[PDB]
Amino acid sequence: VTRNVEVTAEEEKIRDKLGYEAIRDIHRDMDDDHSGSIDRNESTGFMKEDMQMRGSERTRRENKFHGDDDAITVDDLWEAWFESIERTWTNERLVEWLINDVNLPSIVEAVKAKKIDGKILPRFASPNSDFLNKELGIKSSVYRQKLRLNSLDVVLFGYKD
């Protein structure tokens, strides 16, 4: 029922439609002037305001997000996410993260049953809150908020800990 095949980022936009659309929603949320690209002022601004990140936490992440690219398009963001090690996380690795970093043991049995993996992280991180609420059944607003922000951090800037 399942086979392992080499796919391109473009092909995966179609196959992982909900993940791509999540990445696109995140990008629109960060793209404050709607230019279609995220600049260094927008990305740090987003960290500062929407992710409530202190100055000392931002510069490392700015560099990871941008590199030498001063203007991150949706395609750029999708490509970086598509290529990321975190997208490859197993269900096991994802549960390890929920326990050790996010501290949300209450959602673990749902995550395990649904067999979701690293590919779900953008949907966790999406400013459209319907997936965490309705699909995973996370009733707590506080819990959703915390998973969303931790997922954003990992989707946008990679895992570090």
Name residues contacting Ca ion, limited to 6-35 (CB under 5 A). Answer: 31, 33, 35
Instruction: Report the alpha-carbon distance of residue 122 to residue 158 in Å, rounded.
Output: 12
Is 35 assigned a ligand-binding role in the annotation?
yes
Q: Does 41 bind Ca ion (CB under 5 A)?
A: no
Is 43 assigned a ligand-binding role in the annotation?
no
Size of the site for Ca ion (CB under 5 A): 3
Name residues contacting Ca ion, limited to 94-113 (CB under 5 A). Answer: none
Tell me the H-state helices in 51-140: 55-66, 74-83, 91-97, 108-114, 121-125, 130
Instruction: Report the alpha-carbon distance of residue 89 to residue 21 in Å, rounded.
Output: 20
Is 153 assigned a ligand-binding role in the annotation?
no
Distances (CA, A) of 110 to 39, 106, 116: 37, 8, 9
- Shortest Cβ 141–Ca ion spacing (Å): 29
With respect to Ca ion, which residue has the nearer C-beta, 31 or 86?
Answer: 31
Q: Which residues contribute to the annotated binding site for Ca(2+)?
A: 31, 33, 35, 37, 42
